[PDB]
Design a protein around this ligand. Structure first.
Ligand SMILES: *[C@@H]1O[C@H](CO)[C@@H](O[C@@H]2O[C@H](CO)[C@@H](O[C@@H]3O[C@H](CO)[C@@H](O)[C@H](O)[C@@H]3O)[C@H](O)[C@H]2NC(C)=O)[C@H](O)[C@H]1NC(C)=O
Ligand SMILES: *[C@@H]1O[C@H](CO)[C@@H](O[C@@H]2O[C@H](CO)[C@@H](O[C@@H]3O[C@H](CO)[C@@H](O)[C@H](O)[C@@H]3O)[C@H](O)[C@H]2NC(C)=O)[C@H](O)[C@H]1NC(C)=O
Ligand SMILES: *[C@@H]1O[C@H](CO)[C@@H](O)[C@H](O)[C@H]1NC(C)=O
Ligand SMILES: *[C@@H]1O[C@H](CO)[C@@H](O)[C@H](O)[C@H]1NC(C)=O
Ligand SMILES: *[C@@H]1O[C@H](CO)[C@@H](O)[C@H](O)[C@H]1NC(C)=O
Lengths: 214, 624, 220, 222, 214
């Protein structure tokens, strides 16, 4: 078997910057190396074949260079759509081998997210368990802490978080925080809050609401 | 097994005496219940007849004819069910059991040929048909028998045709007998009455006491008055109990009749309830083991490997019928007419009879003898149900080599109720059936072959299923000269098992094979082609694999598994010539591909969308 | 045009068996190859098996060898991958792939991929809660509303807004496993301030493994 | 050749009892569950029951669940429909049919047995005239008939001049009267000139009562 | 209780043409249709099963189609041997019910009825009954309905209509209607008539009874 070791998977760059992705084969591979691009949630598509020839429909900015066992996928001018996972697959032997993917994000301006609070609905209250949702969107970078305050207190070990993948246009992310409380204890207090602390926040921003009042 | 199948021959002569006797012995050795008929004809003097002592029930009819033995022991027989009758009128026939009354002058003290006296001390039931006894110049006591006791009350056909002529002064019934109606002279041969001395309305009884009345579902005599005490169940015998029906195998709710499996379900086989059908029969959804699936039901191979009739949603597949199955029913043989239906018949239903006329013609039908080059119809055949009769083969064919792919023959239809094969009147030298690996049921006869070896060498036991099966040698070409000439297998043939001469036919061999011949070895490094081993088969390496002895040339079929391509590498494949590449999926060849220094079938760096006439020295289309 | 259709994705239990079908439309499978390739979540792609349908030659990867099996039919013009003795790790998006016939061996035309989830967990219908625009969740002239779909398994759950006709300010979220083993998404949309009060919004959640199709309205 | 001879069909009182026997022949009896399907007079088909010989089980429509029984005598290839707890709406022809697959579509059918249920004894028919007049007809064609009324058991045969006038004669199917007694007409059209001299005789034969009656339908002072 | 219906009630058509018979089920059955052909007075013969495939030996002049809740039998070349009743049966759920019937008859001229009337015969009058007979011979088609007019109104329950089958040579539809009354019922009125609502003669015709002369 032949292994493809790729360049580090962090290549945050702005538009127009020359971006290089390095692929090294375990043994000699000749020029049988194809670069595929795949945005998450879709299918990969051949973008450069035989290490030298651009494929039909691919803008001329993309290029490929070969030297020994070192293959460099080069983008002269970065584009917002040029965010995906890139794989330098080889077919020199019977089982084709891929890489670990070079997650090429976009170096953009530090984005301050938009924030929202979602209490359980009336029907959701009647369900038997209340979910409090703290929603963020469009924050650059990714790093942002979220905390839950019940009577202005720490709430950890029960809150759960999820993050969206980088936007194809905004190049940012969106986070959801679910705090699930049984209505046996959800009625102990009256005001619920969530605080968000982000590198794009000058100060942590908190949103609170007094429960039960419509 | 306690259940066998009887013959069906009526008055037809034996194929051979020394074969007929052994056929009878193999069919009725330890059998207790005889499905089908029971036929004894042309028994020579001093016949053994010991194997008949343990037969208790007959499901067809009993026939005895043209015998010279003085006594036929059938004591333990109790019931004759008369499912199918002899001449549609009789279920116990005993006729012509004596000397032909022509010359045959006996010497002093010599017993004349003929049955001396019937001896049946337990036969006290006949469920249908009548009795036919006549022309017995040595029989005694046949007239002093109360036959209306033996017959069943439902059997309205109580017609008896009995003769009394005899040439010997029969001794009187012994004084110990009651009513002077005795089977024989010995004291224990007095008839036991079970239908004329019973209580009011009692079909059967132990004796002349009103508490001796049998259960309502026994057959003949009872040890006790409970249905588990019958001497023979009248209708069904479920696990030692006499019942009217086998339990249903599906439970239905009274509101929707939705099917739910019932663990205690029983299938019906003869007059017995069996948990699972025997090996050869087919289980239908109605709950009865059979042999031919009903309409719109087709054989399907089960997960446990069994065969069962399943329902067809679409029209059932075009099953290629044989002979005697559905509409070629009374058709005797295969002419040049019906043979055309047998094109592309991988599975055939029914027999294949071959009378000599097939290879001797019939002027009335304007049918010439079928061509030895007319047998290509039977080439992709893989399964036959029913027998396979053979009484004509071409001389140009030295054997029955036609059926090289017939894997299974099942004895669902036997020639005379006994025979699944036959090889009589032939001149062949071997068989060559290299794919026949199962022989469902019935004896296989190979008869009157003067040029035939390979009958003492065929692996028999590995094909049969039941102990009742047997194979019979008769008039076969002597094994002594077969060995002297050397008509046996060869070394690669495992265990001396084969079908004919030459290394082609071996049921198994130690080494590998290359399609139809057991080989000495494969050709991995040494050999004219290169072959890799797989399931003991020598698959040839791809041609582009450079044959490099000392190194494994190829690791499988495709081009990718070559050790090193002989000519060029179009990665990941081996090529003899680096082919001209193509731009699109839809075919178009702008060349655009040349081999590199080491054979890497590189693409042409030059590009010519206008198909430039100028061509590069490497073969690329050179830009104008 | 060249299209590949993959079918058979869905929930399965450990030790079970499943079958995937790749049907090719717009081109003949008689002169190309077929590669089934896994996409393990959070991981790089992985090559599984190759079959040539003209003569039906098969080669498998070492890891999945023995368990999986592949076949094809030229007359029906398609390929099949039957997977047996599935493990927990085989949770993946499976992809069908082609090749360029000759002189071209890049995977030019891929499939669409189908999910296979092996978790020995039950299926629970999604519960929808309409998150309406409140007095404290607005942003100037942009009002954010949406639908909270909760407790569905296995993922995904296709959420459509106006049947996908309108895509302005649409932000679906990945499904996050809870402590209960059930995922929840929050399809959030943003609309102009004047837009509300004249056209109410509807969210259509479809959870195929539960076959649950719920339409709901979000209004003040 | 598959054939299912039904028998046992005959008159039986309301709320009575009968034992139809469907003697099968031409196929392996114990491989096909058999069905009883009744076609009423002038009605679409119904489905009474089905029986599986080996188990002896029965599956029927709910309306007859507590009144009909099925029995199998596999010794005689018969099949006994024990009909009991009868009613007026039981008169039908009981087609004994064969399931093809045990899935309730049939292919081979019997001729049927007209099981007739009514408390009406065998009765002699009544003959009445339908003589025309010089004005009762139209053109050169003339219509004259005989009417057979109030006879219970089918059938009755009607002939004209011992069958000498088989030309333009219509005999409509019998009609069930208030009781089980039936009635029918038998008219014929003849040339108008023949009315003067040609004799017209109507012969009605009733075999179940063994009564033959001849009637004269010539116009009497008409 | 799947009430399997069919249409049209009557399908009159000559030889060598195309006609259709529609069978619609109460509920949804995937493929559970068995089409039967029955002659007037003999056992039914299976024609179609699974709604498309013809039974063995059945002529290929026609073949049904459909599924779900709609099935159809389409005649391609009608022949004299195919003038008989037809039905459909759903063998899917309990309790496997049949259709209702659809006849096929040969179309021809539209000949008007030959209508005759009769007075009750005195042999019945002395027998304490009364029967009035109306005859309509040699008209086409069967659509002709008979209105039994008694004076200026009409009644019901005493009119039994007996129609012969499709005639062999002329292929018309002879018919009779019988009005049954008590003996004293006869001496209540004199005007008895039978009119025909037929597309034959332009207007319905009233026939006169011979009272005084006979
Ligand atoms: C049992 O008895 C003898 C043989 O032992 C068989 O023939 C029977 O005996 C004689 C010889 O045929 C018959 O009597 C003679 O018949 C001729 C006929 O023309 C007559 O002309 C003579 O005057 C004399 O009567 C006798 O009838 C005959 N029996 C019968 C029934 O025909 C006999 O067939 C043997 N088998 C039986 C009786 O079942
Ligand atoms: C009904 O079916 C049952 C089985 O379902 C039959 O029972 C079996 O009958 C045979 C014949 O007698 C028994 O074999 C005998 O065994 C004894 C003791 O080992 C041996 O001495 C005899 O020589 C003979 O081999 C067998 O054991 C018995 N099996 C049981 C009872 O489970 C039965 O015969 C059938 N018929 C009737 C009328 O019951
Ligand atoms: C049959 O047995 C008897 C006595 O058991 C003997 O005399 C006779 O020779 C035997 N038959 C033959 C053909 O040897
Ligand atoms: C041949 O026999 C040997 C042992 O006798 C066995 O191991 C082998 O599997 C057999 N091969 C075949 C093809 O039956
Ligand atoms: C293999 O065999 C060829 C001849 O068939 C011979 O020329 C060659 O030296 C051998 N060895 C190798 C390594 O090719």
């Amino acid at each position: 078997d032949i292994q493809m070791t790729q360049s580090p998977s962090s290549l945050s760059a702005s538009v127009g910057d020359r971006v290089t992705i390095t692929c090294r084969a375990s043994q000699d591979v000749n020029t049988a190396v194809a670069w595929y691009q795949q945005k998450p949630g879709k299918a990969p598509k051949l973008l450069i074949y035989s290490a030298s020839f651009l494929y039909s429909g691919v803008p001329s900015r993309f290029s490929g260079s070969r030297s020994g066992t070192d293959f460099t996928l080069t983008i002269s001018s970065l584009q917002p759509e040029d965010f995906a996972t890139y794989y330098c697959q080889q077919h020199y032997t019977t089982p084709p081998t891929f890489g670990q993917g070079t997650k090429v994000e976009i170096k953009r301006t530090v984005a301050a997210p938009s924030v929202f609070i979602f209490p359980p609905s009336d029907e959701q209250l009647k369900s038997g368990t209340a979910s409090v949702v703290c929603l963020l969107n469009n924050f650059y970078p990714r790093e942002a802490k979220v905390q839950w305050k019940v009577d202005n207190a720490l709430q950890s070990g029960n809150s759960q978080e999820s993050v969206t993948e980088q936007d194809s246009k905004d190049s940012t992310y969106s986070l959801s925080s679910t705090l699930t409380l049984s209505k046996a204890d959800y009625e102990k207090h009256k005001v619920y809050a969530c605080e968000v602390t982000h590198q794009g926040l000058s100060s942590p921003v908190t949103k609170s609401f007094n429960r039960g009042e419509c | 097994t306690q259940v066998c199948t009887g013959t069906d021959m009526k008055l037809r002569l034996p194929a051979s005496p020394e074969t007929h006797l052994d056929m009878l012995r193999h069919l009725y050795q330890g059998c207790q219940v005889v499905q089908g008929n029971l036929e004894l004809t042309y028994l020579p003097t001093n016949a053994s007849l010991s194997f008949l002592q343990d037969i208790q029930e007959v499901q067809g009819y009993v026939l005895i004819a043209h015998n010279q033995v003085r006594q036929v022991p059938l004591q333990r027989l109790r019931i004759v069910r008369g499912t199918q009758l002899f001449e549609d009128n009789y279920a116990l026939a005993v006729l012509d059991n004596g000397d032909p009354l022509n010359n045959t002058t006996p010497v002093t003290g010599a017993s004349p040929g003929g049955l001396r006296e019937l001896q049946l001390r337990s036969l006290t039931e006949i469920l249908k048909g009548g009795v036919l006894i006549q022309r017995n110049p040595q029989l005694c006591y046949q007239d002093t028998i109360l036959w209306k006791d033996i017959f069943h009350k439902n059997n309205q056909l109580a017609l008896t045709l009995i003769d009394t002529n005899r040439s010997r002064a029969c001794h009187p019934c012994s004084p110990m007998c009651k009513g002077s109606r005795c089977w024989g002279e010995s004291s224990e041969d007095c008839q036991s009455l079970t239908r004329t001395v019973c209580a009011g309305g009692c079909a059967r009884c132990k004796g002349p006491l009103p508490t001796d009345c049998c259960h309502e579902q026994c057959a003949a005599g009872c040890t006790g008055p409970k249905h588990s005490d019958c001497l023979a169940c009248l209708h069904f015998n479920h696990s030692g109990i006499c019942e009217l029906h086998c339990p249903a195998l599906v439970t239905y709710n009274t509101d929707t009749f939705e099917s739910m499996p019932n663990p205690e379900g029983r299938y019906t086989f003869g007059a017995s309830c069996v948990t699972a059908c025997p090996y050869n029969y087919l289980s239908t959804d109605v709950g009865s083991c059979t042999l031919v699936c009903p309409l719109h039901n087709q054989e399907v191979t089960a997960e446990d490997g069994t065969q069962r009739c399943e329902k067809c949603s679409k029209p059932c597949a075009r099953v290629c019928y044989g002979l005697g199955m559905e509409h070629l029913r009374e058709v005797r043989a295969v002419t040049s007419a019906n043979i055309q239906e047998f094109a592309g018949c991988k599975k055939i239903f029914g027999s294949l009879a071959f009378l000599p006329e097939s290879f001797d013609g019939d002027p009335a039908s304007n049918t010439a003898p079928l061509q030895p080059e007319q047998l290509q119809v039977f080439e992709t055949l893989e399964e036959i149900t029913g027998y396979l009769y053979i009484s004509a083969w071409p001389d140009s064919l030295p054997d029955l080599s036609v059926f090289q792919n017939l894997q299974v023959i099942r004895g669902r239809i036997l020639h005379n109720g006994a025979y699944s094969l036959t090889l009589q009147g032939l001149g062949i030298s071997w068989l060559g059936l290299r794919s026949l690996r199962e022989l469902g049921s019935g004896l296989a006869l190979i008869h009157h072959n003067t040029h035939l070896c390979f009958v003492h060498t065929v692996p028999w036991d590995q094909l049969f299923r039941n102990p009742h099966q047997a194979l019979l040698h008769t008039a076969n070409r002597p094994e002594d000269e077969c060995v002297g000439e050397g008509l046996a297998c060869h070394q690669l043939c495992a265990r001396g098992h084969c079908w004919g001469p030459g290394p082609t036919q071996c049921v198994n061999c130690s080494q590998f094979l290359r399609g139809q011949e057991c080989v000495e070895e494969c050709r991995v490094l040494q050999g004219l082609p290169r072959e890799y081993v797989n399931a003991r088969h020598c698959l040839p390496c791809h041609p582009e694999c450079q044959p490099q002895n000392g190194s494994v040339t190829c690791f499988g079929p495709e081009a990718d598994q070559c050790v090193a391509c002989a000519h060029y590498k179009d990665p990941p494949f081996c090529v003899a010539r680096c082919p001209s590449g193509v731009k699109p999926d839809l075919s178009y060849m702008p060349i655009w591909k040349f081999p590199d220094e080491e054979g890497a079938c590189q693409p042409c760096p030059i590009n010519c969308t206008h198909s430039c006439v100028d061509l590069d020295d490497k073969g690329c289309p050179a830009e104008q | 045009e060249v299209q590949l259709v993959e079918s058979g994705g869905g929930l399965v239990q450990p030790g079970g068996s499943l079958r995937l079908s790749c049907a090719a439309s717009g081109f003949n499978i008689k002169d190309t190859y077929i590669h089934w390739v896994r996409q393990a979540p959070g991981k790089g792609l992985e090559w599984v098996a190759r079959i040539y349908p003209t003569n039906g030659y098969t080669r498998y990867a070492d890891s999945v060898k023995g368990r999986f099996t592949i076949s094809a039919d030229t007359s029906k013009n398609t390929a099949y991958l039957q997977m047996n003795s599935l493990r927990a790790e085989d949770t993946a998006v499976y992809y069908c792939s082609r090749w360029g016939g000759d002189g071209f061996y890049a995977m030019d035309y891929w499939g669409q991929g189908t999910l296979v989830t092996v978790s020995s967990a039950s299926t629970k219908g999604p519960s929808v809660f309409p998150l309406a625009p409140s007095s404290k969740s607005t942003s100037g002239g942009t009002a954010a509303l949406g639908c909270l779909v909760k407790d569905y398994f296995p993922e995904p759950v296709t959420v459509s807004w106006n049947s996908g006709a309108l895509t302005s300010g649409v932000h679906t979220f990945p499904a996050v496993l809870q402590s209960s083993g059930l995922y929840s998404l929050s399809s959030v949309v943003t609309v102009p301030s004047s837009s509300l009060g004249t056209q109410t919004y509807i969210c259509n959640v479809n959870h195929k493994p539960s076959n649950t199709k719920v339409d709901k309205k979000v209004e003040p």
